[PDB]
Design a protein around this ligand. Structure first.
Ligand SMILES: Cc1cc2nc3c(=O)[nH]c(=O)nc-3n(C[C@H](O)[C@H](O)[C@H](O)COP(=O)(O)OP(=O)(O)OC[C@H]3O[C@@H](n4cnc5c(N)ncnc54)[C@H](O)[C@@H]3O)c2cc1C
Ligand SMILES: NC(=O)c1ccc[n+]([C@@H]2O[C@H](COP(=O)([O-])OP(=O)(O)OC[C@H]3O[C@@H](n4cnc5c(N)ncnc54)[C@H](OP(=O)(O)O)[C@@H]3O)[C@@H](O)[C@H]2O)c1
Ligand SMILES: CCCCCCCCCCCCO[C@@H]1O[C@H](CO)[C@@H](O[C@H]2O[C@H](CO)[C@@H](O)[C@H](O)[C@H]2O)[C@H](O)[C@H]1O
Ligand SMILES: [Cl-]
Length: 524
């Protein structure tokens, strides 16, 4: 019966609407733009308050791995979907589960404030502008799905004399089409996934392209092992077990091996200076091809930028530059929340399970999609929303404010705790762990041990095979029937789209390639 306000109709938004309908609540979803998707909807223009995309973007997480747990991608969809097709997939999810009804478009959420009675009612005043007409309205609970990656980050201090530059420059955000660097001399600043992608793209046309890193980065292909989507090999329960039950110094060294096995990162000048602190690995299939053919060349860091030129640290050659692209990442904020509710300190909101603000008397505000997992946002946001709406409904319950506030402070001090691939800093989180924590909380986590006795086929395909989101809706509330069939047909769909030419499962694979061989008994 509870009335839920959903802020934004992005991936996270749609999941909330769906998860609301599903647990029989009344969702009202306020989108500020004129259609759903947020990011995944490519427009020509940059809309403010709404994440922006370049025309060439394709998913850096694979098809059967980054779909809503109860809604696979079509069979005819490529293993890594372009922004065009990703949007269609979202408009399909929206159509299917009848979500379009509940969305009000061109509706900025100007403010969400506790009701005066909140301490007893647990309600919210949601002020919403539409055709320049403010309109207050009371809601029983609010789910915020603004995500991040809309607010650009561009620290001009950090690039001395960029003011003096007489060429043109801009943030990745403002980038749409590669025409603009036809024959120009291009410097892409920051080896962000966006950076690398643009640099590579520029190389197609531009006379010269330089990609200025700072730390450097590890770089891997979508293609990965045997033409298998990397994630369908890497993000599997079994592997995730190995990594997490194995000392940081090893796994990090062990990764460098599996990253260099493509190309010696040292020779290409990508090698991160600081090992043992593995930043998000870059996902680009072209880069090396560009470096070896000299269409893109990695440069160490901007030392200073001149009238019509740039100088890099430890780099004697001053390089003439026409265009500078700052792929320097994005910040995030909540203008409609007050500081009393959500903090936004050090790229982090201080939320219990990166959702609930963990001091509020009543748990009736949820933040969906403010997390940086080791896997796709799509299922995380959804699996987030499942455990969320059931707190708002009161079917599940948060532990005491005393337990949440102190547990949050443990993750907030970014304490490495060694062993498992140290989870960086801000919104750090293992994909499988965080999902299993939440599936537990709503009693959807399948009993794998039991599974093995009852159904052994499925049991193994879930542990050794790719941790596909289907295996979330296998048992518990929201259980999907097709789930089992979907999990076992996993690879059949993954190969139908690549195998466009005939000739005359794929359980585990070769991630732990010099590992399972190296760490097998020395029987004395
Ligand atoms: C180039 C690129 C590629 C990516 N590829 C992948 C990928 O392959 N796989 C993956 O899992 N993730 C990927 N991501 C991450 C991406 O953030 C998610 O995939 C997805 O876009 C999450 O959507 P969201 O709901 O969190 O937020 P968004 O997509 O940003 O949607 C937020 C929505 O909220 C609306 N809004 C904002 N403020 C207000 C307000 N005050 N009132 C009302 N509405 C408001 C906006 O208009 C927008 O529609 C990628 C990101 C980028 C930039
Ligand atoms: N499909 C794709 O391939 C694709 C494309 C774009 C975006 N994405 C998604 O979007 C997310 C974030 O996108 P993004 O790449 O724009 O952000 P990002 O990955 O955070 O990139 C920002 C980069 O800018 C550099 N940087 C940051 N602060 C700096 C400073 N003060 N001075 C100099 N350099 C600085 C860093 O690289 P250096 O350390 O190298 O300088 C950093 O990695 C990704 O994780 C991914 O999910 C995916
Ligand atoms: C195979 C050798 C394992 C050596 C383990 C010794 C190192 C311990 C360091 C801390 C890491 C945690 O260690 C780990 O805990 C639990 C056991 O309760 C198991 O973890 C498991 O949890 C759930 C079941 O509840 C599974 O869905 C998940 O896929 C799996 O990771 C791992 O098999 C074990 O390795
Ligand atoms: Cl452009």
């Amino acid at each position: 019966a509870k009335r839920v306000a959903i802020v934004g109709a992005g991936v996270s938004g749609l999941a909330s609407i769906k998860c609301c309908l599903e647990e029989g609540l009344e969702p009202t979803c306020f989108e500020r733009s004129d259609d759903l998707g947020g990011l995944w909807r490519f427009t020509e223009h940059v809309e403010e308050g709404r994440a922006s995309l370049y025309k060439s973007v394709v998913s850096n997480s694979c098809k059967e791995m980054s779909c809503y747990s109860d809604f696979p991608f079509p069979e005819d969809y490529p293993n890594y979907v372009p922004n065009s097709q990703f949007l269609e997939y979202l408009k399909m999810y929206a159509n299917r589960f009848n979500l379009l009804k509940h969305i009000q478009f061109k509706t900025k959420v100007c403010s969400v404030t506790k009701c005066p009675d909140f301490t007893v009612t647990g309600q919210w005043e949601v002020v919403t502008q539409h055709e320049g007409k403010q309109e207050s309205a009371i809601f029983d609970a609010v789910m915020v799905c603004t995500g991040f990656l809309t607010d650009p980050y561009l620290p001009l201090d950090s690039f001395p004399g960029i003011n003096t530059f007489k060429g043109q420059y801009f943030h990745s955000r403002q980038y749409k089409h590669p025409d603009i660097f036809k024959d120009k001399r291009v410097l892409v600043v920051g080896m962000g996934n966006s950076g690398t992608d643009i640099a590579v793209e520029a190389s197609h046309l531009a006379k010269k392209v330089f990609l200025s890193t700072t730390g450097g980065a590890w770089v891997m292909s979508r293609v990965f092992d045997s033409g298998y989507p990397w994630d369908m090999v890497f993000t599997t329960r079994f592997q995730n077990m190995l990594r997490n039950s194995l000392p940081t110094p090893i796994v990090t060294w062990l990764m460098a091996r599996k990253m260099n096995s493509w190309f010696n990162h040292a020779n290409y000048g990508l090698v991160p200076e600081d090992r043992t602190q593995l930043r998000e690995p870059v996902l680009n299939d072209e880069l090396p091809g560009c470096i070896i053919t000299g269409k893109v060349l990695i440069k160490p860091s901007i030392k200073e930028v001149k009238e019509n030129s740039v100088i890099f640290n430890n780099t004697p050659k001053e390089e003439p530059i026409d265009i500078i692209v700052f792929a320097t990442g994005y910040t995030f904020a909540f203008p409609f929340l007050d500081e009393s509710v959500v903090k936004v300190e050090n790229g982090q909101a201080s939320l219990y399970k990166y959702i609930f603000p963990a001091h509020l008397p009543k748990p009736t505000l949820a933040v969906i999609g403010l997390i940086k997992p080791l896997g796709s946002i799509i299922p995380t946001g959804e699996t987030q929303a499942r455990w969320a709406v059931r707190v708002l409904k009161g079917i599940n319950k948060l532990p005491p404010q005393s337990v949440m506030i102190e547990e949050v402070n443990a993750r907030k001090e970014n304490k490495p705790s060694g062993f498992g691939l140290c989870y960086c800093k801000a919104l750090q989180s293992d994909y499988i762990t965080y999902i299993d924590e939440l599936l537990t909380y709503i009693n959807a986590k399948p009993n794998l041990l039991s599974m093995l006795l009852t159904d052994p086929r499925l049991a193994l395909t879930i542990f050794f095979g790719p941790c596909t989101p289907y295996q979330f809706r296998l048992t518990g509330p929201g259980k999907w029937e097709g789930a089992r069939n979907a999990i076992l047909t996993q690879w059949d769909r993954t190969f139908k789209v690549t195998k466009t030419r005939i000739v005359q499962a794929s359980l585990l694979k070769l991630l732990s390639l010099p590992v399972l061989l190296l760490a097998l008994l020395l029987m004395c």
